[PDB]
Design a protein around this ligand. Structure first.
Ligand SMILES: *[C@@H]1O[C@H](CO)[C@@H](O[C@@H]2O[C@H](CO)[C@@H](O[C@@H]3O[C@H](CO)[C@@H](O)[C@H](O)[C@@H]3O)[C@H](O)[C@H]2NC(C)=O)[C@H](O)[C@H]1NC(C)=O
Ligand SMILES: *[C@@H]1O[C@H](CO)[C@@H](O)[C@H](O)[C@H]1NC(C)=O
Ligand SMILES: *[C@@H]1O[C@H](CO)[C@@H](O)[C@H](O)[C@H]1NC(C)=O
Ligand SMILES: *[C@H]1O[C@H](CO)[C@@H](O)[C@H](O)[C@H]1NC(C)=O
Length: 203
């Protein structure tokens, strides 16, 4: 049947996207590409017609959009505002089918963070608290230890959406360099490399 995929699904700001239309049934009278599920002329961006090949547009922006004979739509410079679901409708008088559910996501390229730790020098069974400073909201922070995934365990505690990380009680094992990392869908940027070394109080 009708399959509509968006390449790339998960788009990036000031980057392009295509509204793929797989197996688009028998050569209809024409197709229509709408925004937002509203099967209303209120939002018609494009209507291509088989039987007499021709491009007529609707009351839709068309500042950067294109419909195709395979019945598909590329979308240039998408923006947070362009985010959301889109719908295509097709018709051949005998029948008009809508079934064009297709949503994708836009993304703000990430920025570099920066840890802040108070006292690289700490005692066994004391506290530490890496905090991954970032100004970007819509986060996926990840904590790295010695350039690999911090296993995250019982004596650790982290909140404010993975921002603040607090290890306690600390133990020599923690003798290493910690780094915080921000994700978006894979448009990432790692933090500095606060090294933390340990001294223990008793002997
Ligand atoms: C519907 O018609 C459009 C015609 O443009 C088809 O979209 C186009 O599909 C190809 C897919 O490969 C895109 O080219 C790709 O380009 C990248 C970079 O050049 C390359 O790495 C890939 O190997 C590939 O060649 C093309 O950009 C894309 N969109 C546009 C706007 O041209 C679509 O495939 C057609 N539907 C079907 C079912 O074929
Ligand atoms: C309709 O076809 C023209 C060329 O005839 C093309 O340049 C234009 O982008 C198409 N309209 C849309 C909304 O894609
Ligand atoms: C780190 O903590 C120890 C506690 O023994 C203290 O002596 C030292 O002054 C602290 N360093 C800073 C920069 O606060
Ligand atoms: C959009 O409105 C329709 C009503 O026809 C509703 O059934 C549908 O759940 C809404 N959006 C999606 C993605 O289904």
């Amino acid at each position: 049947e009708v399959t509509i995929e968006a390449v790339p699904p998960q788009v990036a700001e000031d980057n392009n996207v295509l509204l793929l239309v797989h197996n688009l049934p028998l050569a209809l009278g024409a197709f229509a590409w709408y925004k937002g599920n509203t099967t209303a002329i209120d939002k018609e961006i494009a209507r291509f017609v088989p039987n007499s090949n021709m491009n007529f547009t609707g009351q839709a922006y068309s500042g950067r959009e294109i419909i195709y004979s395979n019945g598909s739509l590329l979308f240039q410079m998408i923006t947070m505002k362009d985010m959301g679901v889109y719908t295509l409708d097709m018709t051949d008088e005998n029948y008009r089918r809508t079934q064009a559910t297709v949503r994708f996501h836009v993304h703000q390229p990430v920025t570099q963070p920066f840890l802040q730790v108070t006292n690289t020098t700490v005692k066994e069974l004391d506290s530490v608290t890496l905090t991954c400073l970032s100004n970007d909201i819509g986060a996926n922070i990840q904590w790295l230890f010695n350039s690999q995934s911090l296993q995250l365990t019982e004596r650790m505690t982290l909140s404010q959406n993975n921002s603040i990380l607090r290890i306690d009680p600390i133990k020599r094992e923690d003798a290493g360099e910690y780094q915080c990392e921000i994700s978006n869908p894979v448009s990432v940027r790692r933090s500095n490399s606060i090294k933390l070394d340990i001294i223990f109080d008793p002997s």
